[PDB]
């Protein structure tokens, strides 16, 4: 009976491999060219983490966690949905912020279950550990705007917004409340539900009927203060210096509650590909000593679907040589000689058949085809006897003596 | 406001030792490209059936979904999982698969997080792949700088020869009264005791043809390409999937492990097929690198950009954009506290994060339309259009 891999989670393959090697090579090599540096933290952390950091009103932590219960140890633990609060934990466990503000990147696998389409999905990100901004806010999200124009990736938007300090928030909070009860008659059930809880998640709404209120609806922006104003229109004045587009989005609320001034998002027009914003809280309501912080994450196959649908797939690497053989004096021959070009730094397959047996020189040869080889290097027993290696450029089928054969091969990759 | 904790038995990997892994990493997959072999990744949960078709007694994590009720569990090990992925998307049609993968695997119980690197060649009955995949792993020793790592290998023949094996076995063990165990799990038996322990029927006596053919000629291949082995009869490894060759690369302990398992595909309901594969536990591995002093230094950045201003800060942004469109890696300042900071704590900054430049703007370098350049000689001015020229030139002596 045939098993199958868990819906919503993916296996990737090797025809898809290259894609995900390019991107990760990609980012991998911004985020040094900023004094980014990696921590990687386990796939499951304790659920009170997630439940303290993300914040109990959400969806997230509500709907969409995998969480479970250690047999042996009782402990209570979760596959992480999300990576900035576990930075945040290892940050404060290991007590990195002592001798100043951090860099830290991050990639790997994270978990939810969500309505459609990946309940594992991957991650790339960033957090600014201990940075006040608002100069970081505009670092990070211009590592974003690198990573399109070096990714190929153009129309990828920006759009910022604030969400204040607390008071601010409780302020506008109210007006929106007062606000929102003038239309109750025209709520929908998700908004009724959201509305004495989270009203800011109204305003995201995609029902038609709402979209002329939402927009009309008191703006956050307008209840900042002046440390708020300034950091807002400090971070504003840097993306203007550096040319950076974007647009104010009053309506953009994220699905953490650990937000608080900048958020921004990165979103495509055929939808959102990067997030993040700052934190300042966070740390302290994890045990920490109080902290300023910024980051973000990008959902990586989001970015590969768009690499797809705009034609960047980069082409299969080869390998540079397919070694073939026929006889027992020949593969002993194809074994060592696949040895010495791997030495010098070639990329080789050996031909090896699936029911073990020799195999005919077509066939591997059909192989060495396939396999995007620029030579087949072949051995049978003229070869073998001769102390030859038969070079066939994939012109014409060449005798090389075999001690020749590096020198020979490095000469006609210069072409 | 209560701290929270890692889970016990899974580190994190901090900054520090993140250069380790990554030479680790880049080493081997570059290794691996070498050889043909190709990416492929399996997610981290899978049916909890797959693993059970001590590890899957004990020490596997494993749960029930909330929203579904299906039986999930995190991955102990890949070879499973990569099996059922290839009989899932059909990826053994158009021939045999050069498969490997990098990743964390979960065991309940010193990591109860870690990591493997691993390959399954696919499809081949070997032994040449068998000779192959263990001559990977040589040389990803030479190229880490390892040495003192050997090779022991074994048979594990075929099911009826390992049955046949048994009976005398026990008729041995039986001879010798010196016993909860003799016919329960008698290979757990093999002090005082040594000498009969060595005289003990060897499975290796009872390998038909078939089976003796494909460990003499894994031999003759390893032989042919200047491998050196020791037959270790005791070499059994802790899954019954296991067939034919088996194989342990061992530092004078384990740090790598295989072996074939053609059974396992037709166990997982695929076409019949033969397979063979390895993996190794990294942490493991990065242990021996630091024991052996191989931990390559940390690599900085080229240039850290220090400024003091309202009006330097800003250029100092704009021309560590410039900096990096030009291939270089670079640090910007930015303080704790938002606004600026002295010279001496900027530089101070520099020095630590390993740059080799400091590039300093302060209001006489903007005036001046220059920037100010410190080796990590002295101090130079440089006009800000000619930076890039002059950091190039200054790097490559
Ligand atoms: N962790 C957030 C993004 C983020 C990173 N840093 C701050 N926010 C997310 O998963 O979307
Ligand atoms: N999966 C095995 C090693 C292996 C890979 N392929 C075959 N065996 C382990 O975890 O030890």
């Given at each position: 009976?045939?098993?199958?891999?868990?819906?919503?989670?993916?296996?990737?393959?090797?025809?898809?491999?290259?894609?995900?090697?390019?991107?990760?090579?990609?980012?991998?090599?911004?985020?040094?060219?900023?004094?980014?540096?990696?921590?990687?933290?386990?796939?499951?952390?304790?659920?009170?983490?997630?439940?303290?950091?993300?914040?109990?009103?959400?969806?997230?932590?509500?709907?969409?966690?995998?969480?479970?219960?250690?047999?042996?140890?009782?402990?209570?633990?979760?596959?992480?949905?999300?990576?900035?609060?576990?930075?945040?934990?290892?940050?404060?466990?290991?007590?990195?912020?002592?001798?100043?503000?951090?860099?830290?990147?991050?990639?790997?696998?994270?978990?939810?279950?969500?309505?459609?389409?990946?309940?594992?999905?991957?991650?790339?990100?960033?957090?600014?550990?201990?940075?006040?901004?608002?100069?970081?806010?505009?670092?990070?999200?211009?590592?974003?705007?690198?990573?399109?124009?070096?990714?190929?990736?153009?129309?990828?938007?920006?759009?910022?917004?604030?969400?204040?300090?607390?008071?601010?928030?409780?302020?506008?909070?109210?007006?929106?409340?007062?606000?929102?009860?003038?239309?109750?008659?025209?709520?929908?059930?998700?908004?009724?539900?959201?509305?004495?809880?989270?009203?800011?998640?109204?305003?995201?709404?995609?029902?038609?009927?709402?979209?002329?209120?939402?927009?009309?609806?008191?703006?956050?922006?307008?209840?900042?203060?002046?440390?708020?104003?300034?950091?807002?229109?400090?971070?504003?004045?840097?993306?203007?210096?550096?040319?950076?587009?974007?647009?104010?989005?009053?309506?953009?609320?994220?699905?953490?509650?650990?937000?608080?001034?900048?958020?921004?998002?990165?979103?495509?027009?055929?939808?959102?590909?990067?997030?993040?914003?700052?934190?300042?809280?966070?740390?302290?309501?994890?045990?920490?000593?109080?902290?300023?912080?910024?980051?973000?994450?990008?959902?990586?196959?989001?970015?590969?679907?768009?690499?797809?649908?705009?034609?960047?797939?980069?082409?299969?690497?080869?390998?540079?040589?397919?070694?073939?053989?026929?006889?027992?004096?020949?593969?002993?021959?194809?074994?060592?000689?696949?040895?010495?070009?791997?030495?010098?730094?070639?990329?080789?397959?050996?031909?090896?058949?699936?029911?073990?047996?020799?195999?005919?020189?077509?066939?591997?040869?059909?192989?060495?085809?396939?396999?995007?080889?620029?030579?087949?290097?072949?051995?049978?027993?003229?070869?073998?006897?001769?102390?030859?290696?038969?070079?066939?450029?994939?012109?014409?089928?060449?005798?090389?003596?075999?001690?020749?054969?590096?020198?020979?091969?490095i000469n006609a990759m210069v072409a």
């Open positions: 009976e045939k098993l199958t891999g868990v819906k919503g989670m993916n296996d990737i393959l090797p025809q898809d491999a290259g894609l995900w090697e390019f991107f990760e090579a990609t980012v991998k090599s911004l985020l040094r060219a900023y004094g980014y540096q990696n921590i990687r933290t386990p796939i499951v952390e304790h659920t009170p983490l997630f439940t303290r950091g993300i914040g109990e009103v959400t969806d997230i932590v509500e709907k969409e966690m995998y969480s479970f219960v250690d047999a042996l140890n009782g402990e209570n633990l979760t596959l992480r949905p999300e990576n900035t609060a576990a930075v945040v934990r290892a940050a404060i466990e290991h007590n990195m912020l002592y001798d100043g503000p951090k860099r830290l990147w991050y990639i790997g696998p994270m978990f939810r279950h969500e309505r459609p389409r990946y309940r594992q999905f991957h991650q790339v990100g960033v957090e600014a550990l201990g940075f006040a901004g608002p100069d970081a806010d505009a670092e990070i999200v211009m590592m974003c705007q690198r990573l399109w124009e070096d990714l190929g990736l153009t129309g990828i938007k920006l759009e910022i917004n604030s969400l204040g300090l607390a008071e601010e928030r409780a302020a506008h909070r109210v007006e929106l409340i007062k606000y929102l009860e003038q239309h109750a008659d025209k709520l929908d059930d998700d908004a009724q539900r959201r509305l004495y809880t989270n009203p800011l998640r109204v305003l995201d709404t995609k029902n038609p009927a709402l979209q002329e209120i939402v927009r009309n609806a008191p703006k956050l922006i307008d209840f900042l203060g002046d440390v708020s104003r300034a950091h807002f229109e400090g971070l504003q004045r840097l993306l203007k210096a550096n040319n950076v587009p974007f647009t104010i989005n009053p309506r953009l609320v994220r699905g953490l509650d650990y937000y608080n001034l900048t958020v921004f998002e990165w979103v495509t027009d055929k939808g959102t590909v990067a997030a993040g914003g700052r934190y300042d809280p966070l740390i302290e309501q994890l045990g920490g000593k109080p902290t300023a912080a910024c980051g973000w994450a990008m959902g990586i196959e989001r970015i590969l679907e768009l690499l797809k649908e705009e034609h960047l797939v980069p082409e299969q690497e080869g390998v540079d040589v397919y070694v073939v053989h026929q006889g027992d004096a020949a593969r002993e021959q194809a074994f060592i000689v696949a040895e010495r070009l791997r030495d010098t730094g070639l990329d080789v397959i050996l031909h090896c058949s699936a029911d073990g047996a020799g195999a005919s020189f077509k066939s591997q040869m059909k192989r060495a085809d396939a396999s995007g080889a620029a030579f087949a290097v072949i051995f049978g027993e003229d070869e073998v006897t001769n102390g030859t290696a038969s070079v066939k450029p994939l012109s014409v089928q060449q005798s090389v003596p075999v001690e020749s054969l590096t020198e020979f091969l």
